[PDB]
Amino acid sequence: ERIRDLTSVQGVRENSLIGYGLVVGLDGTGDQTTQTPFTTQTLNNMLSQLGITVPTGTNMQLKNVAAVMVTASYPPFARQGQTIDVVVSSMGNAKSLRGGTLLMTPLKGVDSQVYALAQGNILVGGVQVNQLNGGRITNGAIIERELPTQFGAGNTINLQLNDEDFTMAQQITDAINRARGYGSATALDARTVQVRVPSGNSSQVRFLADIQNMEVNVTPQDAKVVINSRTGSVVMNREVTLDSCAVAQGNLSVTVGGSLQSVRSSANLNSVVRALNALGATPMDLMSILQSMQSAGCLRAKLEII
Amino acid sequence: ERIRDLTSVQGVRENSLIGYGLVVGLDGTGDQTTQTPFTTQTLNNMLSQLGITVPTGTNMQLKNVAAVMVTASYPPFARQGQTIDVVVSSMGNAKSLRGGTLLMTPLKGVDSQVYALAQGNILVGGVQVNQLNGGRITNGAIIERELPTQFGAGNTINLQLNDEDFTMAQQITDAINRARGYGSATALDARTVQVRVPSGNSSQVRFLADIQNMEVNVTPQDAKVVINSRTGSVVMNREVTLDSCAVAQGNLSVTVGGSLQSVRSSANLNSVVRALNALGATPMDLMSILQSMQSAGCLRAKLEII
Amino acid sequence: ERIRDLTSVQGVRENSLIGYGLVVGLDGTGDQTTQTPFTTQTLNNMLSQLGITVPTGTNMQLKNVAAVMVTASYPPFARQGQTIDVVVSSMGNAKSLRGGTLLMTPLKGVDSQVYALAQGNILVGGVQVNQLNGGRITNGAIIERELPTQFGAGNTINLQLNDEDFTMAQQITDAINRARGYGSATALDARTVQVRVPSGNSSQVRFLADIQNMEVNVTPQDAKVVINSRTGSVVMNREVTLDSCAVAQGNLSVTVGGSLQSVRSSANLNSVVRALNALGATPMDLMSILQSMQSAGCLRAKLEII
Amino acid sequence: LNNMLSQLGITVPTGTNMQLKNVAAVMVTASYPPFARQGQTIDVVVSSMGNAKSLRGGTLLMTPLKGVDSQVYALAQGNILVGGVQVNQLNGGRITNGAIIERELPTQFGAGN
Amino acid sequence: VMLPDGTSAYTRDGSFQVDQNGQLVTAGGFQVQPAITIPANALSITIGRDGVVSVTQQGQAAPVQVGQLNLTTFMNDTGLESIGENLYIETQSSGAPNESTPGL
Amino acid sequence: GAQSSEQTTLPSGLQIGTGVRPVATERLHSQGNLSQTNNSKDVAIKGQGFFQVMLPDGTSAYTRDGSFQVDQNGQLVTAGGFQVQPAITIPANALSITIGRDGV
Amino acid sequence: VSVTQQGQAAPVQVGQLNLTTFMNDTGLESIGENLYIETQSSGAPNESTPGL
Amino acid sequence: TEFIRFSGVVNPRTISGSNSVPSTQVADARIEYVGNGYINEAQNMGWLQRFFLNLSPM
Amino acid sequence: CAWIPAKPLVQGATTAQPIPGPVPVANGSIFQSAQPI
């Protein structure tokens, strides 16, 4: 496995930008201005800024516009002239945003600073119906501000591991040391590996490029089972093992001769799957069976509800 | 069994983060603002922060947003730039969160400190219907704060055993001592094993990586039986044994010649299962039979209701 | 891959222009002036400017005009006499803008300065119905102002990479150095490459023209999976790999013998696709399966909800 | 719910409708195991308290688990799992590893003979 | 009258009311147009025969002009489509509404 | 509306209709005309205003009927044990109770 | 739809009673009980709030 | 002129909605509403009357 | 006289300065005890 696929650099980080905007067009299906006062107020503000002052007391019952929230992912090392994708979601009671246009919405960070400007055309999917109150604009946002970074300064860079593991950190450190000079990397904890790099942005970039594509074997992580209970999904790791036990579940019985089916000990995932299948049951029954089995032991893995 | 599969490190620990947020889009099916005052108030607060001040007296009857609670699992050794998965659950009367977007909700710990920022798109399952008021966002939360830790300091590390057992602790200590130098580990109780490690984060990480993947045999844990009584599940350990007895249950009789079926003594799980199956009964009847049998003896295991 | 296809120049940048205007004709289907006060007010302003002063108290119930917002993309190095395309979107309750005409709307930037003048005929598409409240005018806007630029000044030019990557920056720098003289380029971060160019607009233009068409190989980017959840789309990178695991999903079972289908380890995209297809399921079920699998591991890629 | 909102930073006016149906007040019970460590996790049982119809796919939010001495001994948060004519109990669920211990009980083990 | 849909209806009835926010609604909570807001301290209300509505504030010795209540004439009264609730709505048979102060 | 031909418009389409639903029953609040009972335990009002009363459940109702009484415990009741808000208790030792126009 | 409680002088909103409209009203088939069910000739039901 | 001064300690959880908190919810409530000018001077007792009030028997 | 020195029945300070609390132990847990009484 590549270092880039399971590790992230300390200085490289994403940010969240949020903003308010309006979508025009829509062939009707827009917000009901009677129940969405902010839409009309924002439209009046935009008109006044453009040079049109609508009297305060007016009907202003329009249906071709919808108040929306635009969310964007400020990428690491964002440049002033670059563009990013944005997601536009209806705010009021708009029926749909099929062919709407987002108009010059400022995208700000958590500090209330304008970091981007988003404007463009919304694209939405045209019994599993698509979401017509949420669309995506590709390259719809242009960056405006650049975040200062410490990259290139200092002599140590921290590689951060997703799903921290002491064995994973040790393997990464060993691979880095073997590829580079002696003492090039050192694990600080189960999730952080400090790598010594020469001073200079170019040198650090070259070192990171060399390190990222390195091949490191992935050791057995852990015996983990995931039960959704909301999407009816059960997933088992390759490391899961089953201890010998007997399980009885409602309406389930030996094929043949009755309830209390026996579960043979299984050391590998194939054996575990075969035994569970022999203990015939739907995924919903399997979730309860697994919960009870883990409670009683006989299940050498940790099960988590997602 | 691997040490990692049945033991946890003292310094490695998870935390719970909770926060409040809003979901936009949803193609309707949002909260009824009339019955959910906090949704409209939070939306007005967000609008005012963004720069729009809606008059206090207004209709504000929107249906494309839903007030939600976002829960996250702060992982051990969490880094500032890393991302974690979050779970979004409807708070008011929202019908569904099919294609909603979570907007910049701060995830705080039990100390009321902002530890993460969550924003992204909700994913929900598309007669066993899926949960449409609860979704998951993968990498939807970005960490903001890092918890100080004592890892790397001192010379002793405590391995904590799930489902404490004196035999398990002794086996773990013996395996650690055999693998490493003499006196490397010492059991402090049925659940804690203190291991001596050299000072230094790198040395401790290497020692923990070596220890975690060690193979340790699992001795017989205990004769335990688990009865759900809510999911109709019965599970028996491999160590359960049955003493000779006679059981009579409603509508149950000898196949053949009447009630009061005999239960032969069974030393192993296979014999216990065969005898119980011969005493033909559904799992619901089996639960009562097991309760009465344990009350009268004749059942060399402890039964727990889950 | 060409440098132009994956990099943008520092000085070259687009801008967003917005303006308000009116569309005439439409064979009816225009805004309802009763519910759209700004349309009548703007029409009266235009008439007064042209030399006709309509009394304040009048019916003015017209249906051949629609108030619209016009959006344009100010291109880099825009010249005074050049023309750009514009997008016109209905603002009020207009039914359609089939054959309308946009009349002399000023397009202004975020600084409230008139940067273009837009006027022309709207073109709109003539069960998937087209958007009749949004049209496009080709060459409908003529530029009026020119943005000052620093291009041609200094000796360094920054190439900005879309989807920043340390390996990508290193490859671009190496290609530039190999093509040009030694030390011609230097990577400053994962997204910026500083290139030394001779002083002078003509020399810089020649250098940029030479650099842009250069051929640079694209190294493996990352194992990324994209799930829409709104358009029912799932996309997997060529770098995605699948770890051995067992997955059970509602109504899904082994073809044959029941639930808990086994997923063989797959190193390449073809193997991953074949294994997932063997684990037969629709895209909606596949999204949940992928989420649970990634949560449990067994999926050597990062999945993002779009 | 109002107390939680106020703690998070939202103060709902005292006089309001607040007629919600996506939440249920529950009691969470846990078994503090012997020699419990600070970082370990335990299973919890969540039972409906009011008139909730079901807790099929609910989420338990940061409930403090206290002993008979009124001391917070654990923190429970997670997703409830409930069984999907013998119908299952839909007002009672179990969370595996849903509670993280916070306090450790002193013991005399290792002392004496 | 402005219907909760936002569309405009037209009623020839004056059995008006004042709601909790003080507006002139008409026997069913339908807001009249243009909006007329009675101040909370007003003690008496009169509608001048020309259509001017002015209330008597407390303490102040002057019936301040709070609004102008204007009528609407249609070229074709007969073509109005009745939707019940003593309301009529515009259809292209009646013609466009011509809103004017009473008398004019 | 509903044009029949390309040039005709068919004014005043056919509508049948139903019903005479009573939309409301309003309660005209005018000033009642006073009369002399020559009794101290009756107080009447001139103008707006109601007497507030704690109904046995704690919820405050209103009555424009100052036919008060005195109960065993000194409190002020209104024809059924309706205890005035705020609480005022009448001691037994006072002789004449006067309630001035300023309400004290 | 909203309800009024004993004392509370503000009607706590309790629900919304939506309507479902079909492309073809007549294509529906009857099943008795004054009930129609959606058929291939009726078109999928369009949920809406009343009055819109 | 009139000076209205307030001082106290407010718990940052009784603040409701539009950044408003009743004075009854503020601890250490110090409220002053004072005036100046001859209008305020006319409301002072006077030295001799004050002396008689504080010293004169009965 | 009203100027004679007097001691109000509510004697002592009417204010209490909140205690900052205890510095957290770097045990890896966000939760921190408060010295149970």
Side-chain angles (χ1 to χ4, degrees), chain E residues 72-89:
Chain E
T72 311
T73 177
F74 293 92
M75 185 180 288
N76 185 295
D77 309 282
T78 303
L80 275 297
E81 166 196 348
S82 60
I83 74 179
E85 295 284 330
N86 292 115
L87 316 169
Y88 309 88
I89 71 180

PDB file of all heavy atoms in Angstrom, chain E residues 72-89:
ATOM      1  N   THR E  72     -60.645  48.515  -6.248  1.00  0.00           N
ATOM      2  CA  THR E  72     -60.200  48.006  -7.532  1.00  0.00           C
ATOM      3  C   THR E  72     -61.408  47.870  -8.436  1.00  0.00           C
ATOM      4  O   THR E  72     -62.410  47.267  -8.046  1.00  0.00           O
ATOM      5  CB  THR E  72     -59.505  46.655  -7.384  1.00  0.00           C
ATOM      6  OG1 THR E  72     -58.529  46.732  -6.339  1.00  0.00           O
ATOM      7  CG2 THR E  72     -58.830  46.264  -8.676  1.00  0.00           C
ATOM      8  N   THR E  73     -61.320  48.421  -9.633  1.00  0.00           N
ATOM      9  CA  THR E  73     -62.393  48.314 -10.602  1.00  0.00           C
ATOM     10  C   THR E  73     -61.962  47.396 -11.734  1.00  0.00           C
ATOM     11  O   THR E  73     -60.808  47.433 -12.178  1.00  0.00           O
ATOM     12  CB  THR E  73     -62.792  49.688 -11.143  1.00  0.00           C
ATOM     13  OG1 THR E  73     -63.802  49.537 -12.144  1.00  0.00           O
ATOM     14  CG2 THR E  73     -61.601  50.411 -11.734  1.00  0.00           C
ATOM     15  N   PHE E  74     -62.886  46.545 -12.161  1.00  0.00           N
ATOM     16  CA  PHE E  74     -62.711  45.663 -13.302  1.00  0.00           C
ATOM     17  C   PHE E  74     -63.632  46.118 -14.418  1.00  0.00           C
ATOM     18  O   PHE E  74     -64.755  46.560 -14.168  1.00  0.00           O
ATOM     19  CB  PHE E  74     -63.041  44.216 -12.946  1.00  0.00           C
ATOM     20  CG  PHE E  74     -62.089  43.597 -11.987  1.00  0.00           C
ATOM     21  CD1 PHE E  74     -62.333  43.638 -10.634  1.00  0.00           C
ATOM     22  CD2 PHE E  74     -60.952  42.971 -12.436  1.00  0.00           C
ATOM     23  CE1 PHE E  74     -61.458  43.069  -9.746  1.00  0.00           C
ATOM     24  CE2 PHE E  74     -60.077  42.397 -11.552  1.00  0.00           C
ATOM     25  CZ  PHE E  74     -60.329  42.447 -10.205  1.00  0.00           C
ATOM     26  N   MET E  75     -63.159  46.003 -15.655  1.00  0.00           N
ATOM     27  CA  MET E  75     -64.018  46.383 -16.766  1.00  0.00           C
ATOM     28  C   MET E  75     -65.247  45.497 -16.825  1.00  0.00           C
ATOM     29  O   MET E  75     -66.304  45.929 -17.298  1.00  0.00           O
ATOM     30  CB  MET E  75     -63.248  46.324 -18.080  1.00  0.00           C
ATOM     31  CG  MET E  75     -64.044  46.827 -19.262  1.00  0.00           C
ATOM     32  SD  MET E  75     -63.109  46.759 -20.795  1.00  0.00           S
ATOM     33  CE  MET E  75     -61.933  48.083 -20.546  1.00  0.00           C
ATOM     34  N   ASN E  76     -65.138  44.272 -16.321  1.00  0.00           N
ATOM     35  CA  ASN E  76     -66.186  43.257 -16.406  1.00  0.00           C
ATOM     36  C   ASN E  76     -66.365  42.626 -15.031  1.00  0.00           C
ATOM     37  O   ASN E  76     -65.705  41.638 -14.709  1.00  0.00           O
ATOM     38  CB  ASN E  76     -65.821  42.220 -17.441  1.00  0.00           C
ATOM     39  CG  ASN E  76     -66.903  41.215 -17.654  1.00  0.00           C
ATOM     40  OD1 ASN E  76     -67.230  40.445 -16.763  1.00  0.00           O
ATOM     41  ND2 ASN E  76     -67.457  41.197 -18.842  1.00  0.00           N
ATOM     42  N   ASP E  77     -67.260  43.189 -14.224  1.00  0.00           N
ATOM     43  CA  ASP E  77     -67.552  42.577 -12.936  1.00  0.00           C
ATOM     44  C   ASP E  77     -68.073  41.162 -13.117  1.00  0.00           C
ATOM     45  O   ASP E  77     -67.780  40.275 -12.310  1.00  0.00           O
ATOM     46  CB  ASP E  77     -68.567  43.416 -12.162  1.00  0.00           C
ATOM     47  CG  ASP E  77     -68.184  44.882 -12.077  1.00  0.00           C
ATOM     48  OD1 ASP E  77     -67.310  45.223 -11.253  1.00  0.00           O
ATOM     49  OD2 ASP E  77     -68.781  45.701 -12.810  1.00  0.00           O
ATOM     50  N   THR E  78     -68.841  40.932 -14.183  1.00  0.00           N
ATOM     51  CA  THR E  78     -69.526  39.656 -14.358  1.00  0.00           C
ATOM     52  C   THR E  78     -68.554  38.509 -14.600  1.00  0.00           C
ATOM     53  O   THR E  78     -68.829  37.374 -14.205  1.00  0.00           O
ATOM     54  CB  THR E  78     -70.511  39.757 -15.514  1.00  0.00           C
ATOM     55  OG1 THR E  78     -71.428  40.825 -15.260  1.00  0.00           O
ATOM     56  CG2 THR E  78     -71.297  38.484 -15.638  1.00  0.00           C
ATOM     57  N   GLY E  79     -67.417  38.780 -15.225  1.00  0.00           N
ATOM     58  CA  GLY E  79     -66.498  37.722 -15.574  1.00  0.00           C
ATOM     59  C   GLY E  79     -65.646  37.203 -14.448  1.00  0.00           C
ATOM     60  O   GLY E  79     -64.908  36.240 -14.655  1.00  0.00           O
ATOM     61  N   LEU E  80     -65.713  37.807 -13.269  1.00  0.00           N
ATOM     62  CA  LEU E  80     -64.930  37.309 -12.150  1.00  0.00           C
ATOM     63  C   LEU E  80     -65.309  35.864 -11.859  1.00  0.00           C
ATOM     64  O   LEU E  80     -66.477  35.484 -11.941  1.00  0.00           O
ATOM     65  CB  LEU E  80     -65.164  38.165 -10.906  1.00  0.00           C
ATOM     66  CG  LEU E  80     -64.381  39.453 -10.662  1.00  0.00           C
ATOM     67  CD1 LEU E  80     -62.914  39.151 -10.511  1.00  0.00           C
ATOM     68  CD2 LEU E  80     -64.602  40.465 -11.756  1.00  0.00           C
ATOM     69  N   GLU E  81     -64.317  35.049 -11.529  1.00  0.00           N
ATOM     70  CA  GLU E  81     -64.573  33.679 -11.115  1.00  0.00           C
ATOM     71  C   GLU E  81     -64.646  33.628  -9.599  1.00  0.00           C
ATOM     72  O   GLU E  81     -63.679  33.973  -8.920  1.00  0.00           O
ATOM     73  CB  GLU E  81     -63.489  32.734 -11.621  1.00  0.00           C
ATOM     74  CG  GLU E  81     -63.541  31.378 -10.942  1.00  0.00           C
ATOM     75  CD  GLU E  81     -62.276  30.571 -11.116  1.00  0.00           C
ATOM     76  OE1 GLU E  81     -61.430  30.953 -11.948  1.00  0.00           O
ATOM     77  OE2 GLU E  81     -62.130  29.548 -10.417  1.00  0.00           O
ATOM     78  N   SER E  82     -65.783  33.197  -9.070  1.00  0.00           N
ATOM     79  CA  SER E  82     -65.942  33.104  -7.629  1.00  0.00           C
ATOM     80  C   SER E  82     -65.307  31.821  -7.122  1.00  0.00           C
ATOM     81  O   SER E  82     -65.513  30.749  -7.695  1.00  0.00           O
ATOM     82  CB  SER E  82     -67.416  33.148  -7.252  1.00  0.00           C
ATOM     83  OG  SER E  82     -68.103  32.068  -7.841  1.00  0.00           O
ATOM     84  N   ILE E  83     -64.540  31.929  -6.041  1.00  0.00           N
ATOM     85  CA  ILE E  83     -63.852  30.786  -5.460  1.00  0.00           C
ATOM     86  C   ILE E  83     -64.393  30.515  -4.067  1.00  0.00           C
ATOM     87  O   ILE E  83     -63.778  29.791  -3.279  1.00  0.00           O
ATOM     88  CB  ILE E  83     -62.337  31.025  -5.422  1.00  0.00           C
ATOM     89  CG1 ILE E  83     -61.990  32.022  -4.322  1.00  0.00           C
ATOM     90  CG2 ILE E  83     -61.869  31.544  -6.748  1.00  0.00           C
ATOM     91  CD1 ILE E  83     -60.517  32.295  -4.186  1.00  0.00           C
ATOM     92  N   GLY E  84     -65.550  31.070  -3.761  1.00  0.00           N
ATOM     93  CA  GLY E  84     -66.096  30.946  -2.434  1.00  0.00           C
ATOM     94  C   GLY E  84     -65.410  31.897  -1.481  1.00  0.00           C
ATOM     95  O   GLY E  84     -64.568  32.706  -1.866  1.00  0.00           O
ATOM     96  N   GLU E  85     -65.783  31.791  -0.209  1.00  0.00           N
ATOM     97  CA  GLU E  85     -65.292  32.677   0.841  1.00  0.00           C
ATOM     98  C   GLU E  85     -65.633  34.133   0.564  1.00  0.00           C
ATOM     99  O   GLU E  85     -64.972  35.032   1.083  1.00  0.00           O
ATOM    100  CB  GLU E  85     -63.781  32.523   1.042  1.00  0.00           C
ATOM    101  CG  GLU E  85     -63.342  31.167   1.560  1.00  0.00           C
ATOM    102  CD  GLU E  85     -63.604  30.987   3.043  1.00  0.00           C
ATOM    103  OE1 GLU E  85     -63.576  31.991   3.785  1.00  0.00           O
ATOM    104  OE2 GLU E  85     -63.835  29.837   3.468  1.00  0.00           O
ATOM    105  N   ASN E  86     -66.660  34.370  -0.255  1.00  0.00           N
ATOM    106  CA  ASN E  86     -67.053  35.707  -0.696  1.00  0.00           C
ATOM    107  C   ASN E  86     -65.942  36.398  -1.473  1.00  0.00           C
ATOM    108  O   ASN E  86     -65.835  37.622  -1.456  1.00  0.00           O
ATOM    109  CB  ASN E  86     -67.485  36.581   0.480  1.00  0.00           C
ATOM    110  CG  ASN E  86     -68.775  36.120   1.106  1.00  0.00           C
ATOM    111  OD1 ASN E  86     -68.799  35.707   2.260  1.00  0.00           O
ATOM    112  ND2 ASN E  86     -69.860  36.199   0.353  1.00  0.00           N
ATOM    113  N   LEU E  87     -65.119  35.627  -2.173  1.00  0.00           N
ATOM    114  CA  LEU E  87     -63.992  36.155  -2.925  1.00  0.00           C
ATOM    115  C   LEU E  87     -64.167  35.883  -4.409  1.00  0.00           C
ATOM    116  O   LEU E  87     -64.799  34.902  -4.800  1.00  0.00           O
ATOM    117  CB  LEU E  87     -62.676  35.544  -2.464  1.00  0.00           C
ATOM    118  CG  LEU E  87     -62.452  35.428  -0.966  1.00  0.00           C
ATOM    119  CD1 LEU E  87     -61.239  34.575  -0.698  1.00  0.00           C
ATOM    120  CD2 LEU E  87     -62.276  36.801  -0.368  1.00  0.00           C
ATOM    121  N   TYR E  88     -63.603  36.762  -5.224  1.00  0.00           N
ATOM    122  CA  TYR E  88     -63.507  36.585  -6.663  1.00  0.00           C
ATOM    123  C   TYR E  88     -62.050  36.728  -7.065  1.00  0.00           C
ATOM    124  O   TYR E  88     -61.294  37.453  -6.414  1.00  0.00           O
ATOM    125  CB  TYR E  88     -64.353  37.611  -7.403  1.00  0.00           C
ATOM    126  CG  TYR E  88     -65.779  37.697  -6.929  1.00  0.00           C
ATOM    127  CD1 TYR E  88     -66.136  38.534  -5.894  1.00  0.00           C
ATOM    128  CD2 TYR E  88     -66.771  36.965  -7.544  1.00  0.00           C
ATOM    129  CE1 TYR E  88     -67.431  38.618  -5.469  1.00  0.00           C
ATOM    130  CE2 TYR E  88     -68.067  37.044  -7.126  1.00  0.00           C
ATOM    131  CZ  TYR E  88     -68.395  37.873  -6.089  1.00  0.00           C
ATOM    132  OH  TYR E  88     -69.701  37.950  -5.670  1.00  0.00           O
ATOM    133  N   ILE E  89     -61.646  36.039  -8.122  1.00  0.00           N
ATOM    134  CA  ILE E  89     -60.281  36.129  -8.612  1.00  0.00           C
ATOM    135  C   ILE E  89     -60.304  36.519 -10.078  1.00  0.00           C
ATOM    136  O   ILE E  89     -61.284  36.313 -10.794  1.00  0.00           O
ATOM    137  CB  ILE E  89     -59.491  34.824  -8.411  1.00  0.00           C
ATOM    138  CG1 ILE E  89     -59.998  33.745  -9.359  1.00  0.00           C
ATOM    139  CG2 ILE E  89     -59.593  34.359  -6.988  1.00  0.00           C
ATOM    140  CD1 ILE E  89     -59.277  32.437  -9.218  1.00  0.00           C
TER     141      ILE E  89
END
